[PDB]
Amino acid sequence: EFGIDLEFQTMSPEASEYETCYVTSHKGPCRVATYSRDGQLIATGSADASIKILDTERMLANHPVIRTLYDHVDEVTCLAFHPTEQILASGSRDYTLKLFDYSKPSAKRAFKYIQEAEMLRSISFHPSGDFILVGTQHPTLRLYDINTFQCFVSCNPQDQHTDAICSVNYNSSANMYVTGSKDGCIKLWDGVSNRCITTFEKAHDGAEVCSAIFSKNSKYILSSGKDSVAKLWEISTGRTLVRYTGAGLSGRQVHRTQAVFNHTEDYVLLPDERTISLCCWDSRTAERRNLLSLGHNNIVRCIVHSPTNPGFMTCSDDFRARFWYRR
């Protein structure tokens, strides 16, 4: 329960103090990873349509790749661990949402799947594990019941985004969720009602919003956009409190990448495409800290930080996923 609270000194290592502790390789670009809620496991997905499950303890220290799953026929684009069960939800450009039961080492295929109308872009498990939020290329957000496979949407169509959903995340308590879209909006949603509470328009000066997460206390949203700026928003007021600047480039549009907190939310981390390095700022002041050279031979499209530890995963178009940890 250590987190950012601007209403009321950091207590964790900068990004620059982390080192690569394990490298894994897919047969195509690796553009998604996710942490299990307990932080012990990481799943990686690739354009080679396969999924790896990785044990963080083995990576720190028997093969770290404890699972490989092959039940997609196109790039996997999103992943979410079931909060209580040994199940991984997977979303692909092959229009499917797959559920994998990974309790058995031998398991290769998914047990159930949802066939979708659009390519999946972002999923977020409800902390109960009974529901999954689904962002697709289509502007309207889907709530699926994991047990009945019925799908539900807000009763007010004006709530919806007006372009592809890029990210969906529940907050820590499930009373809210947050979406970011190609329409350049962040939307705050009621987790029970499933109505849109707030729309942050031109959240990143008109550019696509690539990622939006909550701070642990749910008082803030951290977002990033294709204006290559990370922002800390205060939900209560609807305003940007902190601007994390310095990343990006001139001349071409940047590819999609995440801005994350470290486990204590002392730092905001954003991969920079210009240098293949990780920008790191103090979260409270926006002070630029040391740049972390990532060692990737191409752009990092996905970064996920451990919820519990000073660990994170970087996913690259070089086909590789690098596990980072402050030893």
Binding site: A117, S128, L143, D145, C151, F152, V153, V192, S193, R195
Partner: peptide, 14 residues
């Protein structure tokens, strides 16, 4: 955790 109130919502078919 609270749960989504699906009755306050409308079914959707892609």
């Amino acid at each position: 955790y609270p749960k989504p109130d699906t009755q306050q919502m409308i079914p959707f078919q892609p």
